[PDB]
Design a protein around this ligand. Sequence first.
Ligand SMILES: *[C@@H]1O[C@H](CO)[C@@H](O[C@@H]2O[C@H](CO)[C@@H](O)[C@H](O)[C@H]2NC(C)=O)[C@H](O)[C@H]1NC(C)=O
Ligand SMILES: CC(=O)N[C@@H]1[C@@H](O[C@@H]2O[C@H](CO)[C@H](O)[C@H](O)[C@H]2O)[C@@H](O)[C@@H](CO)O[C@H]1O
Ligand SMILES: *[C@@H]1O[C@H](CO)[C@@H](O)[C@H](O[C@@H]2O[C@@H](C)[C@@H](O)[C@@H](O)[C@@H]2O)[C@H]1NC(C)=O
Lengths: 247, 261
Amino acid sequence: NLSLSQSNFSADTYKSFIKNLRKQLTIGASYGSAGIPILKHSVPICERFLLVDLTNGDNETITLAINVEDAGFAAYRAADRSYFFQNAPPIASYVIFTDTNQNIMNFNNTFESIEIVGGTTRSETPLGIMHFEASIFHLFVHDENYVPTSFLVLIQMVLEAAKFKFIEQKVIHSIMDMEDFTPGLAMLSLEENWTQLSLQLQASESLNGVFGDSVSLYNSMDEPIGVDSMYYPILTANMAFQLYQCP
Amino acid sequence: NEQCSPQQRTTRISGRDGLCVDVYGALTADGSRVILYPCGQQQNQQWTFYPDNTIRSLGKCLATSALSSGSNVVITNCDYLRYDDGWMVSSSGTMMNKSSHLVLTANAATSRTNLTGENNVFAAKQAWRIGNYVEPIVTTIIGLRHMCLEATDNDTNVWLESCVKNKTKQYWALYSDDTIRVNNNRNLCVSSSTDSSSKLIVIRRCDGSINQRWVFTPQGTISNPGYEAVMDVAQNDVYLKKIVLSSATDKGNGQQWTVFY
Ligand SMILES: *[C@@H]1O[C@H](CO)[C@@H](O[C@@H]2O[C@H](CO)[C@@H](O)[C@H](O)[C@H]2NC(C)=O)[C@H](O)[C@H]1NC(C)=O
Ligand SMILES: CC(=O)N[C@@H]1[C@@H](O[C@@H]2O[C@H](CO)[C@H](O)[C@H](O)[C@H]2O)[C@@H](O)[C@@H](CO)O[C@H]1O
Ligand SMILES: *[C@@H]1O[C@H](CO)[C@@H](O)[C@H](O[C@@H]2O[C@@H](C)[C@@H](O)[C@@H](O)[C@@H]2O)[C@H]1NC(C)=O
């Protein structure tokens, strides 16, 4: 499996991991005018999951199952145990981690659901190398008090970074500065709007690249920038792939 | 999902020097010319896009006024274009008449300049941002070895240096005409070489040229489409302090860039 380990976690190795993850997710992608790959859709359940290994500073490893249709976590394995989100595709447990003691987490893989059960938001959850490391531990032992925030960390540092070069770069800055951060409005507005940007980009094919609705993306000075077309470098040089939305 | 087929959207259009596409005097007569003008909220800068490939302001359609290059772009009665295929906008913001291939062009930078239909050479004066948000986007530009492009030698050269938050000369203003401008001197633009003998990318006074038109591609390159080449770190070595224009290749990582805003 594609893997990222605490023991070899530099800017260079992180960047390669995210680059490879994007490549794997975009196998068989479709392309529009914008040239931003659109993830596969209607994927048979048996081929719907990409497995990724993360190893922490105790040399313990978890394997996460990423749904290739939406680049979200469906489940993960720790040793001989696995854990499925309650909105994982219904048949997923027959396809992945079959040879393990399977458990259902009583919450969805969405930020809104994770934040409600954990009682903690992304804005208050630090990101960085040591939080990546600790999140893997908490998931490995499945400490229910820390499972939600551990997903907030790993979803953002792995999946959201794959979706957006801006977010990847935030993590890279963190590694190089040896400095934790919490996502601000820039990062959250990307995460919030990934599905809406996917819809507008694809829909814009019929309107000379103009969107049906404007999307507000914040910059690092907390100024909202209206993105109402494909002609914004903060979108088209940032968003690495899209959710399938339009025929 | 009827959201896949938007029926229309009203937006602004900005280009050279961040000025907007404007129906001069808000005049509505057929043949009324369009100009550059400082961006505002007035109705004659509101362009409504429809799926018939029309672009409309004041209820009339943006259109070329001749088959040959050099004549004004105007607004005219939409019924006149009933059998016309309309405008096509490229992913890099070239606005082209589909039949004649003439593109929307600003031959000067000054307010009230008449916009014309001209042969496409991919100049910055032929690049446009369709969108309501018309301001330059302020950013760092990150490249090889996770370093930042920096304006050097009194804003005449450019190369990679270690990224330092708020170091003034590492900020760039991305304009609606596809220019990359020194953030604290917005009369100066990143430029491909004007000397045949050199491939070196430099900083020069903004002039609307092919040399100053840059497209941030989804594949992570900074492309000069008129010269069919991309920004590259000389010899993939940041310590040479040389950024050059090269044919796109996968050989090294020197052609990969990130916009960090
Ligand atoms: C794009 O250019 C073409 C060609 O110059 C324009 O077509 C002409 O339209 C005028 C006015 O309707 C007619 O009198 C001519 O007969 C047309 N010429 C040809 C050869 O078709 C067209 O109007 C332009 N369209 C836009 C939207 O700019
Ligand atoms: C037709 C005219 O001159 N009317 C004035 C208005 O129109 C403006 O014209 C300028 C060009 O000089 C530009 O196209 C701009 O977008 C238009 O708003 C305007 O001056 C108005 C007051 O704002 O007064 C009219 O008299
Ligand atoms: C821009 O377009 C209009 C419409 O065709 C032209 O008439 C303008 O010509 C200018 O004004 C006329 C009255 C005359 O003085 C002419 O010589 C001027 O050039 C034209 N404007 C420019 C700046 O070319």
